[PDB]
Amino acid sequence: SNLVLYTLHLSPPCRAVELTAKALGLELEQKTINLLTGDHLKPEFVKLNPQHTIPVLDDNGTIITESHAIMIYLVTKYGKDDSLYPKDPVKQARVNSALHFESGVLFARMRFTFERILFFGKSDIPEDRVEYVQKSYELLEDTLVDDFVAGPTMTIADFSCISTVSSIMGVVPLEQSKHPRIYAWIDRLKQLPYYEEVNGGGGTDLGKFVLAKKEENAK
Amino acid sequence: SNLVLYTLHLSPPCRAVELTAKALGLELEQKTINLLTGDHLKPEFVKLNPQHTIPVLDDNGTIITESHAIMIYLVTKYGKDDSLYPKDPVKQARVNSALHFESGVLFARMRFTFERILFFGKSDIPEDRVEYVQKSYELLEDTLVDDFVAGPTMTIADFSCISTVSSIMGVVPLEQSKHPRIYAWIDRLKQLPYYEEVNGGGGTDLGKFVLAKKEENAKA
Ligand SMILES: N[C@@H](CCC(=O)N[C@@H](CS)C(=O)NCC(=O)O)C(=O)O
Numbered sequence: 001s002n003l004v005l006y007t008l009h010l011s012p013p014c015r016a017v018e019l020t021a022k023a024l025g026l027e028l029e030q031k032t033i034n035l036l037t038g039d040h041l042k043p044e045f046v047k048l049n050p051q052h053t054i055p056v057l058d059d060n061g062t063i064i065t066e067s068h069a070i071m072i073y074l075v076t077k078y079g080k081d082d083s084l085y086p087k088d089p090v091k092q093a094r095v096n097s098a099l100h101f102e103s104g105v106l107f108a109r110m111r112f113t114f115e116r117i118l119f120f121g122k123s124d125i126p127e128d129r130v131e132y133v134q135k136s137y138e139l140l141e142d143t144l145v146d147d148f149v150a151g152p153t154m155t156i157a158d159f160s161c162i163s164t165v166s167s168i169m170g171v172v173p174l175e176q177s178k179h180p181r182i183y184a185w186i187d188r189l190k191q192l193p194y195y196e197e198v199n200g201g202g203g204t205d206l207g208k209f210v211l212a213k214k215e216e217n218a219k
Numbered sequence: 220s221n222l223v224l225y226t227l228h229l230s231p232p233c234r235a236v237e238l239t240a241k242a243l244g245l246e247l248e249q250k251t252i253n254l255l256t257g258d259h260l261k262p263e264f265v266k267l268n269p270q271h272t273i274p275v276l277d278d279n280g281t282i283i284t285e286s287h288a289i290m291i292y293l294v295t296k297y298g299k300d301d302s303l304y305p306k307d308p309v310k311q312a313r314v315n316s317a318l319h320f321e322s323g324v325l326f327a328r329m330r331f332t333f334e335r336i337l338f339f340g341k342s343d344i345p346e347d348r349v350e351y352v353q354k355s356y357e358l359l360e361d362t363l364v365d366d367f368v369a370g371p372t373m374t375i376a377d378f379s380c381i382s383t384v385s386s387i388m389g390v391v392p393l394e395q396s397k398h399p400r401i402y403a404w405i406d407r408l409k410q411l412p413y414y415e416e417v418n419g420g421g422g423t424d425l426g427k428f429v430l431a432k433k434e435e436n437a438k439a
């Protein structure tokens with residue numbers, strides 16, 4: 001059977017996989033898991049992922065969870081070149097470091113900001129969580145010593161970072177005066193023909209969704 | 220020359236790498252970076268890692284940052300076999316999933332709790348902070364369908380998870396009634412001959428260090 005991705009386009013790590021699929025020329029059949037209606041908490045999905053998160057990949061019965069693991073798996077198995085995820089231990093390590101930076105810092109602090117508005121119905125953002133996001137921006141800025149997060153070549157680490165950054169920057173302002181490297185890096189990824197369709201809209205929408213929910217939770 | 224690790228024994232991701240080295244029979248020449256005195260904010264270290272975090276590996280001139288990347292690098296580079304990090308894409312994926320669960324959920328929420336006490340002079344642990352850690356316990360509990368976090372075999376994903384869990388559980392209590400899988404899993408890792416030296420001491424000490432700092436901060 002087909003390669004299936006259990007996903008939601010609003011979700012940043014889901015968009016990270018979609019970008020990877022596009023960059024690989026892979027065809028992923030998408031099946032929508034509506035987080036908002038609690039589809040991910042249903043027993044049929046929990047069976048696939050006990051952590052009940054998306055994205056989840058179904059590769060002919062073989063279940064793979066977590067976006068970064070999925071991306072690594074996809075490049076390893078279906079990549080016809082290792083540009084997106086090098087075989088060389090040193091270069092691969094630099095990608096892995098950036099990938100874990102994304103999950104450990106960028107994404108984690110993004111959801112530490114979003115879920116209080118999204119899940120707990122609050123209409124504010126505590127400044128300590130704001131600053132934590134701001135510092136993640138700074139850390140990302142410092143990491144971009146080359147054209148891309150994991151070096152001079154675009155890798156899956158860029159897909160993971162841009163999917164999160166394009167979502168959180170719509171809620172916590174990412175100043176161009178303080179983070180010019182990030183904006184230049186965003187502009188490189190925007191030159192990807194499939195960027196806007198896959199991530200552009202989704203990221204802007206999630207960011208707008210949070211802001212919309214924030215205002216709505218205030219009425 | 221041997222491998223150089225810019226490290227601190229109290230640090231969970233540092234101990235995860237040290238666990239990996241011991242499992243690989245590698246000798247790590249440690250260079251201590253005291254975060255409390257801001258050694259990691261020094262220009263010479265920032266050059267090594269612009270994110271100014273530990274651990275950082277120096278393999279004969281080659282710099283590798285971030286514990287999980289380092290752990291993968293060590294097994295790939297010096298592993299006599301791949302049991303700690305499989306070459307097989309599927310089993311490898313299960314490990315990677317666990318690794319990113321640790322940094323994305325386990326460690327992140329621990330840092331969300333610890334950092335403000337250790338560095339920002341705070342003395343309280345808000346209940347939403349506690350809640351979120353508790354929720355990480357449940358997620359780990361539900362992930363342990365096998366004896367180890369990424370399957371029947373012990374992998375570097377267990378090293379990453381235990382180093383964080385053994386630190387956070389001393390602060391935010393892990394109740395045995397709700398998490399029997401975690402406790403059994405912890406007992407398995409404690410059977411490793413190098414566990415207490417490499418992680419069992421450091422993990423307990425960090426949790427104790429947080430509580431001590433929390434007490435001292437509260438006393439103005
Ligand atoms: N590190 C994981 C995080 C995935 C994740 O947290 N997804 C969110 C959507 S952005 C989710 O499924 N939330 C539902 C839940 O945690 O219960 C990955 O990249 O796959």
Ligand SMILES: N[C@@H](CCC(=O)N[C@@H](CS)C(=O)NCC(=O)O)C(=O)O
Nearest residue numbers: 104230232271272273274285286287
């Ligand atoms: N995902 C990273 C996290 C590393 C990390 O956050 N280390 C802490 C010590 S527990 C640190 O260096 N903090 C200093 C800082 O962030 O400025 C890894 O596992 O290497």
